[PDB]
A paper describes a structure:
Here we describe an alternative form, termed N-[name], a [name] vaccine platform assembled from a monomeric HBc protein (N-anti-[name] Affimer HBc 190) with the Affimer inserted at the N-terminus. HBc protein monomers comprise either 183 or 185 amino acids and dimerise to produce structural subunits which assemble to form icosahedral VLPs with T = 3 (90 dimers) or T = 4 (120 dimers) morphologies. The dimeric assembly results in the formation of 4 helix bundles (spikes) which project from the particle surface and a sequence at the tips of the spikes comprises the major immunodominant region (MIR). The VLPs effectively bound [name]-tagged Junín virus glycoprotein, gp1 as assessed by structural and serological analyses.
N-[name] [name] samples were vitrified for cryo-EM data collection. This confirmed two different sizes of icosahedral particles. Reconstructions of each particle stack with icosahedral symmetry imposed revealed that these corresponded to T = 3 and T = 4 configurations, as expected. Interestingly, both reconstructions (resolved to ∼3.5 Å and ∼ 3.3 Å, respectively) showed continuous densities located between the four-helix bundles on the surface of the VLPs. Each of these densities was of appropriate dimension to accommodate an Affimer and was located close to the residue at the N-terminus of a wt HBc 190 monomer, as expected. Unstructured internal density was also observed, possibly representing non-specific binding of nucleic acid derived from the E. coli expression system. Processing of cryo-EM data yielded density maps for T = 3 and T = 4 VLPs resolved to 3.0 Å and 3.5 Å, respectively. Initial inspection of density maps revealed no additional density attributable to bound [name]-gp1, although there appeared to be a subtle change in the orientations of the Affimers, with these being closer together in the N-[name]:[name]-gp1 complex map compared to the unliganded N-[name] map. However, for N-[name], in which Affimers are attached at the N-terminus and spatially constrained between the four-helix bundles, Affimer density was resolved. This suggests that the Affimers in the N-[name] system are more rigidly constrained in their position compared to when presented at the MIR region.
Author numbering:
A (entry chain C), B (entry chain C): 111 to 185, 198 to 258
C (entry chain A), F (entry chain A): 111 to 186, 198 to 258
D (entry chain B), E (entry chain B): 111 to 186, 198 to 257
Write the structure that this text describes.
Amino acid sequence: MDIDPYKEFGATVELLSFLPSDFFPSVRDLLDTASALYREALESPEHCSPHHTALRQAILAWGELMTLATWVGNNDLVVNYVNTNMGLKIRQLLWFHISCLTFGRETVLEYLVSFGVWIRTPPAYRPPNAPILSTL
Amino acid sequence: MDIDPYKEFGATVELLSFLPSDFFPSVRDLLDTASALYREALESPEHCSPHHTALRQAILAWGELMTLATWVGNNDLVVNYVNTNMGLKIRQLLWFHISCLTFGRETVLEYLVSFGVWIRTPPAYRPPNAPILSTL
Amino acid sequence: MDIDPYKEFGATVELLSFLPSDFFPSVRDLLDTASALYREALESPEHCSPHHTALRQAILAWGELMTLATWVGNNLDLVVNYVNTNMGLKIRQLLWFHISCLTFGRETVLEYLVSFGVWIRTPPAYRPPNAPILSTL
Amino acid sequence: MDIDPYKEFGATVELLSFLPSDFFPSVRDLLDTASALYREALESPEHCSPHHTALRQAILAWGELMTLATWVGNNLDLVVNYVNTNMGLKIRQLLWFHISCLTFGRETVLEYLVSFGVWIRTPPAYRPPNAPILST
Amino acid sequence: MDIDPYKEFGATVELLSFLPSDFFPSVRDLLDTASALYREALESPEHCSPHHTALRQAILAWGELMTLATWVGNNLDLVVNYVNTNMGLKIRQLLWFHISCLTFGRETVLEYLVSFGVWIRTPPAYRPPNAPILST
Amino acid sequence: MDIDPYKEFGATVELLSFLPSDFFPSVRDLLDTASALYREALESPEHCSPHHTALRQAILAWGELMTLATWVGNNLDLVVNYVNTNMGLKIRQLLWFHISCLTFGRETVLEYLVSFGVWIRTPPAYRPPNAPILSTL
């Protein structure tokens, strides 16, 4: 079985691999961002949005990955191995769902094709400041 | 942040720890069950149910756990370690979402309190055949 | 003062001594049926039913008895055997009756305790071998 | 599962810790206060106030562990003068709270636990000698 | 800029100087009077009475200078038994005034500070031994 | 008891720890923005806004700390360094947040603290060099 996690939300894995690899903030910055303004919404008993159902499983599954790393740390390249390949897939899943909740789903998707083509023009022919999605 | 994965669906972790530990079928039996009759629904681009959004993330996160186990198998108690503690949490998440999709959400929740009290009566004072939820 | 514990719920102890001593599940499996099915109503800041108020006092009465069991073990064996088995049967049938009045409803349990009475009093030569099962409808 | 026995009645166990441990009358004085006032109502088969359900259970729980004090006495002390002192103190707080909530009303006892809070908190040079008594 | 912390609540700091400096209960007795009564209301994200805003700030200002007493203790006394005695007295007047204005109402505390004025002013031969207590 | 200082105003400390330590002006320039713009409302005998009640307690909490700084200097250096710089950053972001909720309005600040969050978390290679400025409309 092959299923993209972003497929119902209107994006792809390729369109999330369209941004650079080190554009996404770290997991500590992203988890504190969700814990900043989405604690009373994520820990609600009733689900509000399909982003909320996907984000409850993104945090819990990364919790299972971290306690697997501390267990294998006791019994440290393997704790560094998870942040290379398994760590990119959780940052992209966290950044996409946090930003779609704050700003909007279609606003993130239009930003992904805007920052993707901004990073792939020559510097002397593009707007100099990098595009950042923001409120107002 | 502390969030149960079953909290929006009307259950708890305790009510899923109400059944015995080895009641749940293995991950191979459960993944082939979802691949049996939910391939054209889970791999749809549009999300149908909150069980579908939770089940797309249950399969993908267990995929990240298995390739972590083959990587640490190369670089085998650790491949057996994941099936003791990290393996119960994925079987319960797979069994709850497969059975709620087939039969119904409230039918699984009424079955959980039915099989829970069936296993906790003396044998001579209970119905002899174990309760199994089934169609018709 | 000789109070009947569940006289106000439509039963007696004499109606509920008909069940055998091995009819009730153990206190661990009885507290788990209370904790797993409905702890949100037991920890609630209001009293939903008179079974709930009787169930909050019944759990904490057993918890005080379990404090006495570890105290006589650590500080200061037959008395641990006494709380678990002799005074525990009064907690088990108190926990069973209040859980079952909330799961299946109260009138279902009281009609079951009569229909167990016609089964447990007949000699074994003239009764069906399976005991009557408790279930709604 | 840690239940507060008074939480349904509007008082926490922390709010009832305003009263000192040696404030409460003896269990013999509390049971005769019950037997003189509420003997028909406690032994009736009729449903009553939720203090009545908690008062039938608190007397019988004391009665169950009264026979434990009788049984441990002959069959061999330090235990019999522990079971009514330390473990019977939780009966005294439970018997005092339900006798007084039936007689003087519930909300007056909630106003009494606060008004005993301001009495026991004040320094000895500025507190009245009249300890607050509960009267009607 | 010299602000009165009580001026918005109808009392001046001169009017609250009727009460003696050793009248006020200790800060440990005031915080448990808050924690037993108002723990849900203080920690709620909902706007409440203007005593609640001043009570969240008075606890956290005491909490900030509580860590100052911890930090000055090891890192080197006279300072740690000055910061809770002299500088913590302004907390005790601020914690007493807002606990009592929430429980007994605001105008009763304004009527209590005046009625404690006539008690402490009278000569010792003509004053009642009952210091005025605040009850409901 | 673990109280959040501005939970009731629509924020957290975790939402407001995203700003750097050098984002806030010093306590002298923060008290002057309170004293010069509106001291008539801070010295007023009524509470206009819940930011005003939180601002009266925040100024006098710092004034008590400045009394401790001169007392440890005159009577009885690293502890003067501690109040000014380590516990002063908790006063600076408390003074900044309540002043800005009264100047620009509260919803403007909370939408600014999110939009600073998307700026401060991105790496410097992919963010514009100027930080987002706070202003109404």
